């Protein structure tokens, strides 16, 4: 299926002409991002072996999401660039949809941590058996929405045989699918920032009350500092017509800024008890 990818990469502008052989390479940034993947797989593997003893499953689910995100982007670099024209479009949907299920479950799990710290606070509703029925239905819905949204192009919703709907970052994806992903990502983002402000507004109750919780809800909002410049660029992609906005060609720098969020999540969420500080005493 090489000529199908050739026509879409000629429509987008990443392949210049029907005679030129492709040569998308740097050999600097494509070894840099591997060491970024080599740190995300190394950080998140250490989180999973360190836990053995409710507690820690939400941190363990998130570090599992960031593990597979580090595995899939390391897979994605080795199958992109000059190698991406040896791939079938059915293989191409697997390479790109593997990053929408891992990063989709990573962002959905951050919402599940947001509902967990909100639930056990001021009001114990008897609507939910909160023992293990809540922790299983959250993580089940975090991975069900991620696979459903992430594998939604390969089941049909793509720009195959409809070139004006082709995105410039993802040359086979649908711009209407991206606008579905923009509108529900912001719906995840405005949900987290109103719950995290509600948790800060509901710890004001009856040494002192130093409240470190204002200082941590700002530092966990590096999530908007890591993820929103990609979704500006997705909003640029759906809005800009083809070959008119050339900031979309440096989009791989906006991808890693969403994937360095997977490196920060072992730092932001494992500051309790300081496990690593004892775990390498000798």
């Amino acid at each position, epitope marked *: 299926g090489q000529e199908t990818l050739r026509e879409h990469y*000629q429509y987008v502008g990443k392949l*210049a002409g029907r005679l030129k*052989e492709a040569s998308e390479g740097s050999t600097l940034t494509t070894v840099l991002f591997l060491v970024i993947c080599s740190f995300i797989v190394l950080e998140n593997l250490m989180v999973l072996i360190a836990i053995w003893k409710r507690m820690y499953f939400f941190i363990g689910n998130l570090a599992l999401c960031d593990l597979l995100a580090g595995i899939a982007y390391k897979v994605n670099i080795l199958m992109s660039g000059k190698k991406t024209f040896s791939l079938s479009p059915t293989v191409w949907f697997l390479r790109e949809g593997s990053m929408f299920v891992a990063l989709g479950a990573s962002t959905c799990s951050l919402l599940a941590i947001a509902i967990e710290r909100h639930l056990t606070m001021i009001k114990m509703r008897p609507y939910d058996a909160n023992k293990r029925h809540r922790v299983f239905l959250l993580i089940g819905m975090c991975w069900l929405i991620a696979f459903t949204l992430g594998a939604l192009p390969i089941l049909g919703w793509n720009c195959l045989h409809n070139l004006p709907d082709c995105s410039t970052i993802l040359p086979l994806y649908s711009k209407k699918y991206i606008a579905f992903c923009i509108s529900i990502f912001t719906a995840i983002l405005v949900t987290i920032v109103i719950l995290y402000a509600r948790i800060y507004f509901l710890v004001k109750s009856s040494e002192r009350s130093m409240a470190l919780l204002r200082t941590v809800v700002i530092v966990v909002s590096v999530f908007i500092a890591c993820w929103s410049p990609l979704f500006i660029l997705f909003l640029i992609d759906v809005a800009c017509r083809v070959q008119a906005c050339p900031i979309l060609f440096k989009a791989q720098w906006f991808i890693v800024l969403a994937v360095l969020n997977s490196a920060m999540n072992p730092v932001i969420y494992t500051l309790a008890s300081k496990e690593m500080r004892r775990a390498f005493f000798r």
Partner: antibody
Amino acid sequence: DVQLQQSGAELVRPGASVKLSCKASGYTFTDYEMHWVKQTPVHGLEWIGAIDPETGGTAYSQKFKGKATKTADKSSSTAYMELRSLTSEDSAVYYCTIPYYSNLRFAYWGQGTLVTVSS
Amino acid sequence: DIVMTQSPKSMSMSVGERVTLSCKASENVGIFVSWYQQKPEQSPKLLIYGASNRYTGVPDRFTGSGSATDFTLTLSSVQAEDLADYYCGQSYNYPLTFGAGTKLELKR
């Protein structure tokens, strides 16, 4: 930014040869193809051929396989097209243009070299 | 190759009228058809690439349309600097083939 300076004004005897040039500036020359288009008042716009500047690989039309010959010198960022044994049919304006980003958008054209074939 | 048949050959216009130029293809070309404008002793200057994607500096009176075989280019108000020659070209397969021409002229 992107100009295609083109060596214009030629005048050639019949049976002689001519070598035209299209000089590129404002972009990396080895990343996009160079195309050459011929315009007569009778036959209209005619495609002569194209060339990939890095790795000197060409593709022609079958009408011009034998007239036109294309080279590319990446050290000077210019492209050459050589017409050979010209008749009166070969007197036209020859444009150079690029597929800028892709063959979808031929946005940047040259200026034309007028070739008059008299004797 | 791929023959593109462009009509009309010439049409005499007065300022402010609407015109629509047709360009049909012998084959499926997709949406790779462009539209160019040429003035005397000047390069062809690209107006519309793609289905209907206006190049930078092309006004709102230029409108493209088409898919696979039938392609149109319309002018909602012909202005005085739009009086030039116009072409369509296919760009879907090398060799590139263009139309024959459409000369917009002044009506008296």
